Design an enzyme around this catalytic site. Structure first.
Site, PDB file in Angstrom:
ATOM      1  N   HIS B  53       1.754  -8.937  -4.013  1.00  0.00           N
ATOM      2  CA  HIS B  53       0.007  -9.786  -3.286  1.00  0.00           C
ATOM      3  C   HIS B  53       0.158 -11.091  -3.954  1.00  0.00           C
ATOM      4  N   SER B  76       3.801 -13.620  -1.185  1.00  0.00           N
ATOM      5  CA  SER B  76       2.879 -12.085  -1.926  1.00  0.00           C
ATOM      6  C   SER B  76       4.028 -10.639  -0.460  1.00  0.00           C
ATOM      7  N   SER B  81      -2.937 -10.340   2.094  1.00  0.00           N
ATOM      8  CA  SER B  81      -3.441 -10.403   0.772  1.00  0.00           C
ATOM      9  C   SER B  81      -4.116 -11.084  -0.367  1.00  0.00           C
ATOM     10  N   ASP B 129       6.926  -5.781  -5.318  1.00  0.00           N
ATOM     11  CA  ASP B 129       6.248  -4.884  -5.195  1.00  0.00           C
ATOM     12  C   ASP B 129       6.064  -3.465  -3.417  1.00  0.00           C
ATOM     13  N   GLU B 154       7.011  -2.313  -8.716  1.00  0.00           N
ATOM     14  CA  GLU B 154       5.829  -2.350  -8.767  1.00  0.00           C
ATOM     15  C   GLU B 154       4.705  -0.877  -8.251  1.00  0.00           C
ATOM     16  N   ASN B 179       6.030   1.478 -11.878  1.00  0.00           N
ATOM     17  CA  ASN B 179       5.267   2.661 -10.330  1.00  0.00           C
ATOM     18  C   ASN B 179       4.923   3.655 -12.055  1.00  0.00           C
ATOM     19  N   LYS B 184       0.716   2.815 -15.912  1.00  0.00           N
ATOM     20  CA  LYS B 184       0.951   2.347 -14.309  1.00  0.00           C
ATOM     21  C   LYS B 184       0.661   3.629 -12.753  1.00  0.00           C
ATOM     22  N   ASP B 188      -3.508   2.484 -12.424  1.00  0.00           N
ATOM     23  CA  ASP B 188      -3.504   1.487 -11.532  1.00  0.00           C
ATOM     24  C   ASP B 188      -4.091   2.274 -10.253  1.00  0.00           C
ATOM     25  N   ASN B 189      -3.079   2.977  -9.390  1.00  0.00           N
ATOM     26  CA  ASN B 189      -3.054   4.159  -8.351  1.00  0.00           C
ATOM     27  C   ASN B 189      -4.460   5.043  -8.709  1.00  0.00           C
ATOM     28  N   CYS B 193      -7.418   2.584  -6.948  1.00  0.00           N
ATOM     29  CA  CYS B 193      -8.239   2.644  -6.116  1.00  0.00           C
ATOM     30  C   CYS B 193      -9.833   3.196  -5.905  1.00  0.00           C
ATOM     31  N   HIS B 299       0.795   1.589   1.388  1.00  0.00           N
ATOM     32  CA  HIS B 299       2.126   0.112   1.082  1.00  0.00           C
ATOM     33  C   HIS B 299       1.381  -0.787   2.138  1.00  0.00           C
ATOM     34  N   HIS B 351      -7.390  -4.220  -6.715  1.00  0.00           N
ATOM     35  CA  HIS B 351      -7.491  -3.786  -8.108  1.00  0.00           C
ATOM     36  C   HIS B 351      -8.346  -4.706  -8.983  1.00  0.00           C
ATOM     37  N   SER B 359      -0.726  -2.388 -15.069  1.00  0.00           N
ATOM     38  CA  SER B 359       0.435  -2.892 -14.295  1.00  0.00           C
ATOM     39  C   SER B 359       0.509  -4.101 -14.884  1.00  0.00           C
ATOM     40  N   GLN B 363       5.276  -4.473 -16.212  1.00  0.00           N
ATOM     41  CA  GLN B 363       5.689  -5.368 -15.438  1.00  0.00           C
ATOM     42  C   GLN B 363       6.900  -6.570 -16.310  1.00  0.00           C
TER      43      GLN B 363
HETATM   44  N1  LIG Z   1      -3.484  -0.426  -2.114  1.00  0.00           N
HETATM   45  C1  LIG Z   1      -3.520   0.199  -3.619  1.00  0.00           C
HETATM   46  O1  LIG Z   1      -3.299  -0.539  -4.156  1.00  0.00           O
HETATM   47  C2  LIG Z   1      -2.263   1.122  -4.081  1.00  0.00           C
HETATM   48  C3  LIG Z   1      -2.076   1.126  -4.768  1.00  0.00           C
HETATM   49  C4  LIG Z   1      -0.827   2.537  -5.515  1.00  0.00           C
HETATM   50  C5  LIG Z   1       0.167   2.226  -4.883  1.00  0.00           C
HETATM   51  N2  LIG Z   1      -0.815   2.077  -3.546  1.00  0.00           N
HETATM   52  C6  LIG Z   1       0.380   2.464  -2.138  1.00  0.00           C
HETATM   53  O2  LIG Z   1       0.186   3.727  -2.091  1.00  0.00           O
HETATM   54  C7  LIG Z   1       0.118   4.662  -1.224  1.00  0.00           C
HETATM   55  C8  LIG Z   1       0.750   6.314  -2.076  1.00  0.00           C
HETATM   56  O3  LIG Z   1       0.919   6.006  -3.537  1.00  0.00           O
HETATM   57  P1  LIG Z   1       0.758   7.166  -4.657  1.00  0.00           P
HETATM   58  O4  LIG Z   1       1.209   6.833  -5.450  1.00  0.00           O
HETATM   59  O5  LIG Z   1      -0.143   8.241  -4.309  1.00  0.00           O
HETATM   60  O6  LIG Z   1       1.913   8.304  -3.535  1.00  0.00           O
HETATM   61  P2  LIG Z   1       1.936   9.826  -3.910  1.00  0.00           P
HETATM   62  O7  LIG Z   1       3.042  10.378  -3.841  1.00  0.00           O
HETATM   63  O8  LIG Z   1       1.551  10.786  -5.421  1.00  0.00           O
HETATM   64  O9  LIG Z   1       1.547  10.218  -2.893  1.00  0.00           O
HETATM   65  C9  LIG Z   1       1.226  10.854  -1.890  1.00  0.00           C
HETATM   66  C10 LIG Z   1       0.384  11.888  -0.952  1.00  0.00           C
HETATM   67  O10 LIG Z   1       0.878  11.709   0.236  1.00  0.00           O
HETATM   68  C11 LIG Z   1       1.298  13.767   0.674  1.00  0.00           C
HETATM   69  N3  LIG Z   1       2.011  13.633   1.460  1.00  0.00           N
HETATM   70  C12 LIG Z   1       2.808  13.281   1.872  1.00  0.00           C
HETATM   71  N4  LIG Z   1       2.818  12.891   3.418  1.00  0.00           N
HETATM   72  C13 LIG Z   1       1.634  13.370   3.920  1.00  0.00           C
HETATM   73  C14 LIG Z   1       1.717  13.539   5.088  1.00  0.00           C
HETATM   74  N5  LIG Z   1       2.370  13.621   6.354  1.00  0.00           N
HETATM   75  N6  LIG Z   1      -0.689  14.119   5.696  1.00  0.00           N
HETATM   76  C15 LIG Z   1      -0.535  14.812   4.303  1.00  0.00           C
HETATM   77  N7  LIG Z   1      -0.139  14.505   3.181  1.00  0.00           N
HETATM   78  C16 LIG Z   1       0.838  13.625   3.286  1.00  0.00           C
HETATM   79  C17 LIG Z   1       2.347  14.482  -0.220  1.00  0.00           C
HETATM   80  O11 LIG Z   1       2.439  15.412  -0.503  1.00  0.00           O
HETATM   81  C18 LIG Z   1       1.778  12.962  -1.500  1.00  0.00           C
HETATM   82  O12 LIG Z   1       1.004  14.606  -2.408  1.00  0.00           O
HETATM   83  C19 LIG Z   1       2.301   4.146  -1.244  1.00  0.00           C
HETATM   84  O13 LIG Z   1       2.756   3.624  -0.273  1.00  0.00           O
HETATM   85  C20 LIG Z   1       1.951   3.415  -2.648  1.00  0.00           C
HETATM   86  O14 LIG Z   1       2.931   2.233  -2.149  1.00  0.00           O
HETATM   87  C21 LIG Z   1      -1.344   1.248  -2.754  1.00  0.00           C
HETATM   88  N1  LIG Z   2      -5.693  -7.292  -7.444  1.00  0.00           N
HETATM   89  C1  LIG Z   2      -4.619  -7.092  -7.040  1.00  0.00           C
HETATM   90  N2  LIG Z   2      -3.439  -8.124  -7.426  1.00  0.00           N
HETATM   91  C2  LIG Z   2      -2.070  -7.780  -7.492  1.00  0.00           C
HETATM   92  N3  LIG Z   2      -1.360  -6.267  -6.772  1.00  0.00           N
HETATM   93  C3  LIG Z   2      -2.624  -5.140  -6.941  1.00  0.00           C
HETATM   94  C4  LIG Z   2      -4.149  -5.496  -6.732  1.00  0.00           C
HETATM   95  N4  LIG Z   2      -4.448  -4.189  -6.213  1.00  0.00           N
HETATM   96  C5  LIG Z   2      -3.587  -3.948  -5.956  1.00  0.00           C
HETATM   97  N5  LIG Z   2      -2.575  -3.967  -6.658  1.00  0.00           N
HETATM   98  C6  LIG Z   2      -1.738  -3.424  -6.104  1.00  0.00           C
HETATM   99  C7  LIG Z   2      -1.012  -3.712  -4.544  1.00  0.00           C
HETATM  100  C8  LIG Z   2      -0.177  -1.961  -4.486  1.00  0.00           C
HETATM  101  C9  LIG Z   2       0.853  -1.587  -3.701  1.00  0.00           C
HETATM  102  O1  LIG Z   2       1.264  -2.042  -2.656  1.00  0.00           O
HETATM  103  C10 LIG Z   2       0.140  -0.962  -6.216  1.00  0.00           C
HETATM  104  O2  LIG Z   2       0.630  -0.370  -6.394  1.00  0.00           O
HETATM  105  C11 LIG Z   2      -0.836  -2.086  -7.107  1.00  0.00           C
HETATM  106  O3  LIG Z   2      -0.198  -2.320  -8.326  1.00  0.00           O
END
Ligand SMILES: NC(=O)c1ccc[n+]([C@@H]2O[C@H](COP(=O)([O-])OP(=O)(O)OC[C@H]3O[C@@H](n4cnc5c(N)ncnc54)[C@H](O)[C@@H]3O)[C@@H](O)[C@H]2O)c1
Ligand SMILES: Nc1ncnc2c1ncn2[C@@H]1C[C@@H](CO)[C@H](O)[C@H]1O
Ligand SMILES: NC(=O)c1ccc[n+]([C@@H]2O[C@H](COP(=O)([O-])OP(=O)(O)OC[C@H]3O[C@@H](n4cnc5c(N)ncnc54)[C@H](O)[C@@H]3O)[C@@H](O)[C@H]2O)c1
Ligand SMILES: NC(=O)c1ccc[n+]([C@@H]2O[C@H](COP(=O)([O-])OP(=O)(O)OC[C@H]3O[C@@H](n4cnc5c(N)ncnc54)[C@H](O)[C@@H]3O)[C@@H](O)[C@H]2O)c1
Ligand SMILES: NC(=O)c1ccc[n+]([C@@H]2O[C@H](COP(=O)([O-])OP(=O)(O)OC[C@H]3O[C@@H](n4cnc5c(N)ncnc54)[C@H](O)[C@@H]3O)[C@@H](O)[C@H]2O)c1
Ligand SMILES: Nc1ncnc2c1ncn2[C@@H]1C[C@@H](CO)[C@H](O)[C@H]1O
Ligand SMILES: Nc1ncnc2c1ncn2[C@@H]1C[C@@H](CO)[C@H](O)[C@H]1O
Ligand SMILES: Nc1ncnc2c1ncn2[C@@H]1C[C@@H](CO)[C@H](O)[C@H]1O
Lengths: 430, 430, 430, 430
Positions: B53, B76, B81, B129, B154, B179, B184, B188-189, B193, B299, B351, B359, B363
């Site tokens: 991103h 990206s 994003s 990532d 990531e 990750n 991290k 971050d996670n 969020c 993701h 974030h 994070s 890296q």
């Molecule tokens: N958007 C963001 O900024 C950001 C930041 C961190 C990670 N992510 C992404 O978010 C997602 C999850 O990360 P995480 O660190 O929480 O993973 P995690 O493993 O800790 O979590 C997810 C959970 O989902 C559950 N689950 C799986 N299938 C399922 C289903 N069908 N119904 C209900 N629950 C179910 C699992 O048991 C699990 O506990 C990944 O794709 C990850 O890469 C996004």
């Molecule tokens: N502001 C940001 N810049 C870059 N990466 C980010 C930002 N916010 C969330 N992310 C990442 C997006 C993720 C999922 O692909 C990561 O795990 C997380 O580190």
């Protein structure tokens, strides 16, 4: 020779209408008013001049009133709160609105002036937020007072003004205190700022709240909501207060309560919620951590000494609209939001529509009350009847799927009350 | 004949630079890396291709790496994003970046392709990532594998891919699981969020959270943060899970844990955090309350059946970028955010910078590790050493004014550990 | 010539049995073990000596093991934690138990000694909590080591001891780390202290928590639970830490993180959760606010310098059992709970039964594992398999009415895992 | 021929005195009253008969009044709330007290009767909690009314009675509504039950709260505190309400609001806070999960149909005092606490002393007011003046180290108020 309205760009009406469509679906109280009064037009004859932030929510209120039969002319009660797409949708619908985001002070006054005289005669009703329209009429257009049947006032600061006026023989028209309906003060002021204070700080700065020390001046309904919001994201919240009762409430909720002279050295984020002048001064700014964020959410921009920053900083960089970053002689930086004007409306979109439905249902009820039953309202400041206050709340339960309990006749007798309410004495604080 | 970069508008560089200036001040971990390695350039020789991103935070990371001596080319890892002002500031600084908000899928792939070959030779390092760059090289450009010294990854989904690859003899280059550094995954996670999920829902819809039922699928680190955020604003949160341990954690925190088949009938807001396919289906959409809001923060956009909505709705109205409101045959409406792509980055700014510093410090450390000490990393998937993980955290304490305690030699002997750490065994879960 | 047991009053057995009846209904994991293994007696042949707080919960564990076929002899692992009605019910059931609330140190050791030799031969299994039994055998009865097939250890401090022993060639018997099963450390240590720390402070002092500053030393799983409990009742919580990661976690949750040298001047309530010596010293006591309450919840009473109070106070008044109020030379008073021994068990009844079912189901599984499959456990320290850890949690879902989701085969393939788990990699931190 | 007092065991006085010593140090409001009025004895001449739970807190109140010069005779306002060591300390100090834990109903009435006539003449003042003494005098001893100068009433139910009496020409003596002072209703009713409801459930059952569904009937100040307490420990809380405003407040805080007919099938724990009859009926009990815990915290035991359980259960086992476990025809079990009497006082020690200092400082002020300034109180029901309400709070700030802010004269003018208060209008709800 008078403009039929004045907005930033009529071209935004389509996007605005889409906005109002979504909002209407979040505002059952206003929708239910239209469903009940569109047929009978209880406001027929009313010429309502409104002075209240020209937002999507306010547009739904404006159209609810029109639907109920009144003629309406509107202005915003803040130079930075208007939402241009909402103002355009209203203008387009042919309602006279004079408002845009970013007015100068002279324009702000000009806009209010364009609402006083309608096609067919001066205003016979006021819907105010802050008292500015109320004070303009009482001070520059008293001659119009006999023609005004009532005033409904939205906020704490405006309500306080009204009581100061009534205590001084100045109030010449009946006024309903809408801020103090329970369904307004304990919902809009609290839960609304709980969500829109963060929205404004975020859209403006994108700053992480977790890990920060935040200082909230005042622990009234607005400070309570703001403090709760900041603490929910992981900020350590310090509170300042002048009232021993609110101070003890904050302490018993786990907040350190101290003075601004002391807290200015600790805060990373500052929010003023007091409705009072001289909260954050130059002496406080010189003690602040680098890049401290400073904002106000109280009605008027009188809490922070923004003039001091403009006169004493060595640099001033506009980051984006409503976000200024200063550099002081000590080399440290201060991020100031919306030039000190209420941050939730200046940097974001104000409270979400659902809670605003509670406030505006109260406002419509007040207008109907005063307009439709003036014999019930002598000159002074009044409260909507508890029975109407409860009705506002009941009108929002279905949307949330709340299943309310009904007292059995046995229970109602034991409690000495009606099965249909009021369920609380008048001094109840909820 | 190759573009030196490709962004939406180079003209946004000035605003972007202002953005990076503020962000730098929120990212002590990255700033401290530059302060320690700008002199010695440990990354001299590295030709790092990044796929992550393209935001303000990522721009500070990109410049930290350059400062440490590497040559960098970036794309990206999501079509919605990129933050155009940040991409422009980078482009302007003369770093090759290929990214803009709103790419088509073919363009998305094209952008990654423009990062593989540098002025002086193919990439010798990957900063990924989600695994897309990692999978592109292993599947279309294996010939470049011998020239790649390492991969730092990531996110959870990318890390899971890596373990699937390693388990299948495919992984051909050493990889550090970023990750799963504690600093991290548990920051971050979770905390990230916790703040940016709401930001995205708010900027997109302005909906009131209080009073709503919200359904969060998954209770991992992301679901934990999302659930906590929604509940802090007054939503009643229902959780779905497949893992008995995470399910019991959610129950013991006061959340109702049930299935999507059941919850789809109750939710007003839906957020998918599982990283798994087929979470919200057409059968779920047909049961939803009117104007339910549906988004994904996992993701990849594989959790919600957006194709089903496009093929089965009777209407589809774009409210604004990344916000679509459908009307189904049953007459009810569905608000879909970012077409199902991660909502925090698609509808807001991801974030906040402070947590992203945790994070990205991880890296930078990973890049240095692999680049600077390859003898320490056999082909496979590794974790940064706990001592480095702890250093990431310590580098962020000063900004928050945390006064950490130092073990006395007496205490350190009693605990059987060094006064300077590691303070925890490797299986510690924090 | 040996006592068949030794308790405070066998006459309490009836009340105790009633206690166990209620508890059994709160412990589905233990009840489900009996339902599955009473028939096959997998523990037949085992002669289990237990050293773990003799409470209602432990009595249900003891009877679960007996039901599974083992012969059991028990002692408490703390001089103030035994619940006499539970010990009596066990004694009465004819199980040899040597335990009572308020033992002297010599008696404490005596009680453990009475469990080493059974009617038909020395112990062939250890179930420890803190390592005391484990250390007694390894240091005074090594000759019995070849006859001991395994050790299962309940708590953080005991587990740390085991790793110190294994690192020094001393550990001579296979040991399963029960503290670190996820279903133990992230539930018992966290949610259990979240409820029983307050219980102990309340039964001892009846003090209002709201409005107080509370200082919690350590932010591990126990400190996390304690801090959360205190803050939920309105205390302002200050945290001390030596680990930069735990310190940053606490800061990001809104807690001020500083040193005891500084916090001792602010706290009204002090709780030590570190598992380390020299946390609260005489120099800290002399700075404390009047009637500050000071307690420890870590395994051993080594965190607070209670000797200092006894030697330096001008007065010492026993308020009731386990509650002493001192008066210092500065005229100020200090309330010390349980003489520094773990407060939840010393002043109240320990963690509630439901969470203890998670811990004890883990313990029964460990015993069965070691006893039933020794070929799978070389000398060292091991973890129960994730699949068993998940089974512990699943066994408690029905009581809470949790409806867990089942992966479709499609989903399970996409995730690369079995529909029946394990659902997480081994490094997962939950 | 009349007993000088009647308690369970005078021998408990020493332990009780120790209890009062600790409590005094937690009650600055009461201590500050003694410091200000012991010299002038404003209550000299007053013959105060009290009917209010005979606890450690009440003993400090009783001695504060005596110190202020009045003659006092006391009885408890509940058969299970007296704390025998506190009653003994009072008896011993030579104050006539008639109270013990576990009175029969005839004895309860007898005890109140022993307080009406003093050595030198009938009562000239009433200090009531629930209205029982107030109703006894108005119905059986009206002749004593002319000799009674005033009534101060502690709780919501008693206050409601008073308004029913005043509305019916029955109230014959001036009464001050102490429940509704802000410093009482928004602190004692809320923060006090927030801590003592859990205390009572815990001492009675030791049940884990986390993971449970708890049903709280009523969302007034008591329900608000109870719901918050349960949710802080991880229970999922369901609320029942008859008032649309309180129902909407609960929904906006994230609680599911529904009916008892529906919730009785889900709850594991039931708490009634309504002050109304017929809340939990036999039809509800027959739907309950096994071992559901059922208690009441409202003033009178009229909320739960305990008679139904006694008449319809197949078994009834007393677990310990105030804890009964029934077995119904459907084979399922119900745990009933304190036979339906207020659980915080029946199964634990009521609210902690610090918050009770707020309530009792209000009570002392009311007594002084009525006694010392009767010309200011016509027959009816009154509120203490806001200025006194604020003084109660200010008297508790120092103990918590709160640094309150002082308005500058400039600020006070802008706000139109005195620097020394009142700082709020009379309708303020805090
Ligand atoms: N958007 C963001 O900024 C950001 C930041 C961190 C990670 N992510 C992404 O978010 C997602 C999850 O990360 P995480 O660190 O929480 O993973 P995690 O493993 O800790 O979590 C997810 C959970 O989902 C559950 N689950 C799986 N299938 C399922 C289903 N069908 N119904 C209900 N629950 C179910 C699992 O048991 C699990 O506990 C990944 O794709 C990850 O890469 C996004
Ligand atoms: N502001 C940001 N810049 C870059 N990466 C980010 C930002 N916010 C969330 N992310 C990442 C997006 C993720 C999922 O692909 C990561 O795990 C997380 O580190
Ligand atoms: N921006 C918004 O959406 C919105 C919504 C509601 C009300 N408002 C405005 O917010 C402000 C406050 O409203 P409210 O309903 O909370 O008023 P409130 O009376 O309930 O609150 C404010 C408090 O500030 C305290 N205070 C006054 N001077 C102070 C000083 N110098 N230092 C510290 N504390 C001080 C007072 O004691 C008081 O408790 C008003 O201007 C009001 O009109 C804004
Ligand atoms: N009483 C109970 O019911 C119960 C239940 C679980 C564990 N325990 C016991 O509680 C204690 C801790 O357990 P845990 O699972 O939380 O361990 P943890 O390792 O997770 O935690 C403790 C923390 O204390 C910190 N710390 C160490 N020395 C310190 C010092 N001088 N100052 C400040 N912080 C310091 C460490 O960094 C660490 O994060 C152990 O003795 C354990 O056996 C008691
Ligand atoms: N045990 C204690 O320490 C203590 C302290 C304060 C008050 N009290 C007592 O607690 C009870 C309530 O006090 P309060 O200050 O909360 O009163 P409140 O008026 O603020 O509250 C109670 C609520 O119950 C609701 N309610 C009435 N009938 C109902 C029904 N059938 N179903 C669902 N909801 C219903 C009402 O709408 C109301 O909001 C009174 O008896 C009071 O005297 C006990
Ligand atoms: N979205 C919105 N539209 C209109 N008024 C709003 C909005 N959000 C907050 N307000 C108002 C702003 C206030 C202060 O002037 C009120 O008290 C509050 O009702
Ligand atoms: N009620 C209880 N019965 C037995 N052990 C308990 C209880 N409460 C807490 N414990 C244990 C005490 C601990 C510390 O020695 C553990 O880690 C924890 O499992
Ligand atoms: N410890 C206590 N001592 C005396 N009264 C108490 C205590 N705890 C709660 N109460 C009172 C009991 C109530 C209901 O009758 C009140 O409203 C409340 O003030």
């Amino acid at each position: 020779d008078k403009l039929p309205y004045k907005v930033a760009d009529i071209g935004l009406a389509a996007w605005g209408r889409k906005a109002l469509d979504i909002a209407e679906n979040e505002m059952p109280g206003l929708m239910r008013m239209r469903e009940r009064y569109s047929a009978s037009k209880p406001l027929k004859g009313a010429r309502i001049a409104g002075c209240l932030h020209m937002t999507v929510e306010t547009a739904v209120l404006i159209e609810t009133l029109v639907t109920l039969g009144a003629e309406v002319q509107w202005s915003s009660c803040n130079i930075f709160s208007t939402q241009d797409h909402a103002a355009a949708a209203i203008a387009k619908a042919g309602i006279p609105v004079y408002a845009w985001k970013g007015e100068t002070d002279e324009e702000y006054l000009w806009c209010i002036e364009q609402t006083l005289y309608f096609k067919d005669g001066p205003l016979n009703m006021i819907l105010d937020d802050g008292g500015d329209l109320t004070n303009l009429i009482h001070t520059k257009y008293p001659q119009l007072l006999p023609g005004i049947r009532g005033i409904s006032e939205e906020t704490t600061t405006g309500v306080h003004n009204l009581y100061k006026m009534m205590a001084n023989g100045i109030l010449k028209v009946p006024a309903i205190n809408v801020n103090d309906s329970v369904t307004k003060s304990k919902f809009d002021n609290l839960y609304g700022c709980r969500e829109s204070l963060i929205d404004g700080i975020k859209r403006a700065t994108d700053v992480m709240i977790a890990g920060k020390v935040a200082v909230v001046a005042g622990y009234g309904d607005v400070g309570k909501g703001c403090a709760q919001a900041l603490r929910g994201f992981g900020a350590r919240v310090i509170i300042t207060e002048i009232d021993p009762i609110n101070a003890l409430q904050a302490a018993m909720e786990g907040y350190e309560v101290t003075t601004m002279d002391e807290a200015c050295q600790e805060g990373n984020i500052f929010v003023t919620t007091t409705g009072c002048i001289d909260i954050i001064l130059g002496r406080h700014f010189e003690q602040m951590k680098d890049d401290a964020i400073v904002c106000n959410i109280g009605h008027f921009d009188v809490e922070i000494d923004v003039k001091w920053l403009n006169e004493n900083a060595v640099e001033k960089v506009n980051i984006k609209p409503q976000v200024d970053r200063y550099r002081l002689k000590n080399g440290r930086r201060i991020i100031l939001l919306a030039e000190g004007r209420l941050v939730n409306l200046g940097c974001a979109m104000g409270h979400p529509s659902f809670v605003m439905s509670n406030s505006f249902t109260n406002q419509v009820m007040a207008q109907i009350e005063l307009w439709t039953h003036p014999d019930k309202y002598p000159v002074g400041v009044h409260f909507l009847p508890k029975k109407l206050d409860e009705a506002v709340a009941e009108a929002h339960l279905g949307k949330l799927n709340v299943k309310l309990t009904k007292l059995t006749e046995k229970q109602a007798q034991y409690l000495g009350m009606s099965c249909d309410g009021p369920f609380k004495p008048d001094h109840y604080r909820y």
